[PDB]
Amino acid sequence: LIST
Amino acid sequence: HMHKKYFIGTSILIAVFVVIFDQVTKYIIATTMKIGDSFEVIPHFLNITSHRNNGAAWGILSGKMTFFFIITIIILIALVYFFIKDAQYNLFMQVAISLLFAGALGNFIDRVLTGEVVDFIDTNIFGYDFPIFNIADSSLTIGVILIIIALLKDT
Ligand SMILES: CCCCCCCC/C=C\CCCCCCCC(=O)OC[C@H](O)CO
Ligand SMILES: [Zn+2]
C-alpha cells in the first residue's frame, strides 16, 4: 500500500 | 443530523478529494522539478524533495510490482467488504476505511502507470531518515491511526  | 446505514455520499467524496490532491501534488512535483531537487516550505523542518519509490528498500526481488499489484487489489476489495459488513451505522470507521482506501488507490495509480511512486514530502519532524512520502501515504497513516483509536474501544 505505502510507497515502498 | 443524518443517521444512515452507509454514508456513501460522505465516504466517496472523501476518497475523491484525497485522490485528487494526491495525484495533483504528485504531478506538480513531476513536471516542475528533477529527481534530487529540493526547495523549502517551512525552513529547516519541511522540504519538497523530489523522489521516486520502486521498493528498493526491500533489496533484490524478481517481480515486486506484480506482488504489490496483487496485494493492493486484495486489500482494496477487503476494505469495501469491511465497509459493508462491520462499518454499518458507524461514520467514524467508514471515514477511516475511506482514508485507507483512498491512500492505497493513490499509490496504486502511480505503480500501474509508471511502475514507481512519486514521493515529495521531506520533513525532520519524526526524526531523520524517515523516508520521503506523499499524500497517499498520509491518508493511509491517518486511517490507521483512526482505526487504532476505533480498535481502542473495549479497553
Ligand atoms: C500533508 C498531509 C496531510 C494532508 C493529507 C491528509 C489526507 C486526508 C486526510 C483526512 C481528510 C480530512 C478528514 C475528512 C473530514 C471528515 C468529514 C466528516 O466526516 O463529516 C463531518 C460530519 O459533519 C461530522 O458529523
Ligand atoms: Zn441524531
Residue numbers in the entry:
A (entry chain B): 1 to 4
B (entry chain A): 0 to 154
Question: What did the original publication write about this model?
Answer:
However, crystals and a structure to 1.92 Å resolution were obtained for the LspMrs-globomycin complex when the tag was removed. With a sequence identity between LspMrs and LspPae of 31%, it was not surprising that the structures of the two complexes were similar with a Cα r.m.s.d. of 0.713 Å over 155 residues. Globomycin, a 19-member cyclic depsipeptide that includes five amino acids (g.Ser, g.Thr, g.Gly, g.Leu g.Ile; the g refers to globomycin) and an α-methyl-β-hydroxy nonanoate, inhibits LspA by lodging the β-hydroxyl of its g.Ser between the catalytic aspartates. An extracellular loop (EL) between strand 2 (S2) in the β-cradle and H2 sits above the substrate binding pocket in which resides globomycin. Looking into the binding pocket from the membrane plane, globomycin binds with its g.Ser hydroxyl lodged between the catalytic dyad aspartates and with the rest of the depsipeptide ring bound to the right side of the pocket neatly tucked in under a retracted EL. In the globomycin complex, the loop includes a half-turn helix from which extends conserved Trp57. The tryptophan reaches over the globomycin molecule and secures it in place against one side of the substrate-binding surface of the enzyme by hydrogen bonding. In the case of globomycin, the g.Ile and g.Leu apolar side chains and the nonanoate acyl chain extend from the bottom of the ring. The latter wraps around the membrane embedded portion of H2 below the apolar surface of the EL. Differences were noted at the C-terminus that was fully formed as an extended helix in the myxovirescin complex but was disordered, and without useful electron density in the globomycin complex.
